[PDB]
Design a protein around this ligand. Sequence first.
Ligand SMILES: *[C@@H]1O[C@H](CO[C@@H]2O[C@@H](C)[C@@H](O)[C@@H](O)[C@@H]2O)[C@@H](O[C@@H]2O[C@H](CO)[C@@H](O[C@@H]3O[C@H](CO[C@H]4O[C@H](CO)[C@@H](O)[C@H](O)[C@@H]4O[C@@H]4O[C@H](CO)[C@@H](O)[C@H](O)[C@H]4NC(C)=O)[C@@H](O)[C@H](O[C@H]4O[C@H](CO)[C@@H](O)[C@H](O)[C@@H]4O[C@@H]4O[C@H](CO)[C@@H](O)[C@H](O)[C@H]4NC(C)=O)[C@@H]3O)[C@H](O)[C@H]2NC(C)=O)[C@H](O)[C@H]1NC(C)=O
Ligand SMILES: *[C@@H]1O[C@H](CO[C@@H]2O[C@@H](C)[C@@H](O)[C@@H](O)[C@@H]2O)[C@@H](O[C@@H]2O[C@H](CO)[C@@H](O[C@@H]3O[C@H](CO[C@H]4O[C@H](CO)[C@@H](O)[C@H](O)[C@@H]4O[C@@H]4O[C@H](CO)[C@@H](O)[C@H](O)[C@H]4NC(C)=O)[C@@H](O)[C@H](O[C@H]4O[C@H](CO)[C@@H](O)[C@H](O)[C@@H]4O[C@@H]4O[C@H](CO)[C@@H](O)[C@H](O)[C@H]4NC(C)=O)[C@@H]3O)[C@H](O)[C@H]2NC(C)=O)[C@H](O)[C@H]1NC(C)=O
Lengths: 198, 208, 246, 208
Amino acid sequence: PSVFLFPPKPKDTLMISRTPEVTCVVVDVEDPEVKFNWYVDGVEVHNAKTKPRENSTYRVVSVLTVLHQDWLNGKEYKCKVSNPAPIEKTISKAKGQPREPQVYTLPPSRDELTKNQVSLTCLVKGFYPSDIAVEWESNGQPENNYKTTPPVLDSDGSFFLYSKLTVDKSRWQQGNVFSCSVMHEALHNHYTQKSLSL
Amino acid sequence: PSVFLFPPKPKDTLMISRTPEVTCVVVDVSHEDPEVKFNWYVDGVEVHNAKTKPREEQYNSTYRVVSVLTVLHQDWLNGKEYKCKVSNKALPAPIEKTISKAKGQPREPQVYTLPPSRDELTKNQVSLTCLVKGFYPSDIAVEWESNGQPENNYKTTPPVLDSDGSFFLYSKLTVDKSRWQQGNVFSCSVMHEALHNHYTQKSLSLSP
Amino acid sequence: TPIKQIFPDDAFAETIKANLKVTQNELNSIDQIIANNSDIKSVQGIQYLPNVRYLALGGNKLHDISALKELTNLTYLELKWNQLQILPNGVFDKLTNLKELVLNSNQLQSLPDGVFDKLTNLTYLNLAHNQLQSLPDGVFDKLTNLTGLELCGNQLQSLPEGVFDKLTQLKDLRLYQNQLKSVPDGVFDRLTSLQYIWLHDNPWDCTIRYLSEWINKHSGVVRNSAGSVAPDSAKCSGSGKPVRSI
Amino acid sequence: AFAETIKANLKQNELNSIDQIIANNSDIKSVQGIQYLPNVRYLALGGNKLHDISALKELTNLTYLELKWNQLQVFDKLTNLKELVLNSNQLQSLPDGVFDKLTNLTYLNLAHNQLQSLPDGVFDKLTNLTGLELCGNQLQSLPEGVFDKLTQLKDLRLYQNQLKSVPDGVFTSLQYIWLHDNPWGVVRNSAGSVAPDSAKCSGSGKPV
Ligand SMILES: *[C@@H]1O[C@H](CO[C@@H]2O[C@@H](C)[C@@H](O)[C@@H](O)[C@@H]2O)[C@@H](O[C@@H]2O[C@H](CO)[C@@H](O[C@@H]3O[C@H](CO[C@H]4O[C@H](CO)[C@@H](O)[C@H](O)[C@@H]4O[C@@H]4O[C@H](CO)[C@@H](O)[C@H](O)[C@H]4NC(C)=O)[C@@H](O)[C@H](O[C@H]4O[C@H](CO)[C@@H](O)[C@H](O)[C@@H]4O[C@@H]4O[C@H](CO)[C@@H](O)[C@H](O)[C@H]4NC(C)=O)[C@@H]3O)[C@H](O)[C@H]2NC(C)=O)[C@H](O)[C@H]1NC(C)=O
Ligand SMILES: *[C@@H]1O[C@H](CO[C@@H]2O[C@@H](C)[C@@H](O)[C@@H](O)[C@@H]2O)[C@@H](O[C@@H]2O[C@H](CO)[C@@H](O[C@@H]3O[C@H](CO[C@H]4O[C@H](CO)[C@@H](O)[C@H](O)[C@@H]4O[C@@H]4O[C@H](CO)[C@@H](O)[C@H](O)[C@H]4NC(C)=O)[C@@H](O)[C@H](O[C@H]4O[C@H](CO)[C@@H](O)[C@H](O)[C@@H]4O[C@@H]4O[C@H](CO)[C@@H](O)[C@H](O)[C@H]4NC(C)=O)[C@@H]3O)[C@H](O)[C@H]2NC(C)=O)[C@H](O)[C@H]1NC(C)=O
């Protein structure tokens, strides 16, 4: 009977058009029946779900919907499983004073312009906490051939990351303008957009 | 009574100047029977060259005893498989675990340095970024150097799974906008198995 | 002075020993303090760190916050789950840089008139699940930049008229789980930016024609306890029928 | 069995788009059908129960062949082979010169089989070999000049065999050789350390 607690996806706490949620997860556990009580900020809630179950892996999961900006506000989420005695575990957004991310866009190395497709990169340094969303887009529509590294702890005690978008060099060299969009709590409107072109 | 098998550092196995080792850790061995017996098998043949560290208690009021094993030459790169087997009184059968370099065909990394965003030259300190893309497996080591001697102020991103199955990562070296502007030449050195001499070095600086 | 000499609270010494890993120049180097669920009784000595800006004090056992009166560089103040019983007057008057104040789940019996009025920069105020019976008249009138206001879980008997007057920037107002029988006419009519209102679990006297008409007009800002949009959630007392349905 | 590797590789013309097959420590007895996918390069088969590699004699473009722990007891047509892994099998000899075609090969691992003989001239036709592993065999005949046509060799392993002597003169690139456990700065010991006295004279055990 091992229990874990996993925070919502940053894409969901910052886009709001999506419903975030905190995922409680219990493994190990014959007796595959576990009651789940939930508490937000010390007070019990009952709106949580439970998905059908799954070595003989007891992957039974309860997901709980985040209300509005409860995550960023700093609400604390507690999951309580029962058969042992009840095992409680808590999860909350990283404490510390927020810092606004710097977003810089960085065009492909000249030495890469020998290959069928080039790499466009977005550097986002010095934000806090690490909860952050990054996406790409071209002339009104969004791109989708991009990967974003995870937050990395920096010398100054904040985070950075990079997103690499990959496009056909025919599309870079034509002068098309791509946009890196970034969503974090320390940004006005939770939002900034950086562009780069030839 | 739980066992964890860590690989050698890429830095060790690509430099050979440094000495690679595969570490087998066991925790939760207490009290009752504090007796652990590691057996090591490289590519399937048992071996007896592992010098075992002394056990060590922690505030968990339990033991965590470590065995470390040396890697003979390019064995990790060559695909040798390393297996650890712990025998303690506190469990039915002994525990086993094998670790080995990731299978898949090796691919050469591409290495591209990127100068600072123009909006970053409005600051006291700029970022020189290194793009390493298209390598396999993930075992890789990235360093920076200026004028022959090394720079020690960079953070490197962990390897990321790309859309075509290879890995990529970034390395951000931070420097003073003046050093960049005076025209010093910095370098991103890269150590990987699919590289000639397991090395490549790309440089960036501004020339008007 | 040593660690032991400035801070008589065992736990509070242990957190200033952890932050710095002392000289007044050292103590004046402290910009934030993260000391939640740390079994803390009094913050005696917190007055010598005037440049602290972030303060995580939730989950502790504070009775008096008197030593924070002057910390003028504060902006986040999190005192959720402590043992505060009543709020000394003027204690917040000097924290004019606060943006967010979290007094979540204490034991506060009432609010003095105008205790918040020197917090014009506040965007977030959490007073939920305390023990408030009523609210100073226009207490929320100097709080013009307030984006979210949480009051849920109290025993609020009634709301002052226009108590939410100068709250145009309010986007989230939480009132559920209260002893509310009715609301002033035009209490919500100025709440222009309001995108989330929480009104379920209240004994709505439906004897209730203003609120019945304010909800139909704004049949999209009401949300039930699960997060889904749900205006039929404000149920009349006794009958149990939704308010908006009269 | 073998098909589930394919069904996972391919999550006709479909078999042409398979360049690498990673499928070790499985329960594979036949590899048949492996000829119906020519444009294939990387092959990982360690921990199966094979004895025929007839089905592979015509995969011409494959460059890695991993056959650790199989029941083997053909190579002339895959000259692009570069790394051939054939340890822990049971093979009792080796056809008289089946390593001659694959000139491009650079790593040969024949460790822990059953070889009392070594067909002369089998090693002479692949000059760029970096590592060679003959440890853990029934060696007793080390034919002469066999390691003479091998210049680029850096690792050569001869530990745990039954050599009572060598043709003095059979031994420049070489940095690593292993001679221990045989009963008669480039030599090392099973524990990865330059150890010249680990060649002990039979019975007397006197290093020489
Ligand atoms: C029977 O087998 C099952 C599962 O089998 C598994 O799958 C098969 C196919 C094989 O690969 C098996 O070898 C393998 O075992 C076992 O179930 C496992 O139980 C372990 C613990 O015993 C769980 O480990 C935890 O994993 C979390 C992270 O979990 C994410 O990433 C995992 C892979 O890295 C993955 O397993 C998870 O599913 C999960 O993936 C993420 O999940 C969310 C929710 O869906 C999703 O939104 C994400 O997008 C997704 N991300 C991905 C996939 O990338 C790990 O963090 C836990 O570590 C904490 O506690 C550890 C103590 O064990 C300790 O080592 C760590 O330090 C850490 O402690 C915490 O650290 C963080 C960061 O600092 C912080 O919260 C705190 O500091 C600290 N909190 C503390 C101490 O309380 C932990 O390791 C496995 O996830 C789970 N496997 C799966 C699939 O769930 C089972 O145990 C077996 N039964 C036995 C042995 O008896
Ligand atoms: C009481 O005693 C100890 C001590 O408590 C701990 O120490 C104190 C100081 C406090 O910090 C406490 O918070 C803390 O709890 C407890 O011991 C711990 O037990 C847990 C699990 O039971 C272990 O977690 C596993 O460890 C590895 C990673 O561990 C490295 O990283 C840690 C920090 O990041 C570091 O602390 C460790 O020492 C260790 O460090 C490495 O060591 C080597 C050489 O020594 C070095 O070369 C490395 O560079 C170094 N790395 C560093 C510093 O970063 C983690 O990988 C494990 O995850 C795998 O297994 C999980 C199953 O639990 C599974 O869920 C995961 O998904 C993952 O599974 C594997 O994943 C890969 C690919 O994804 C793959 O191989 C397989 O899919 C899969 N294989 C499997 C499952 O077998 C896991 O998190 C802690 O290491 C251990 N702490 C120490 C110091 O040893 C103990 O539990 C307590 N016992 C009680 C209360 O009863």
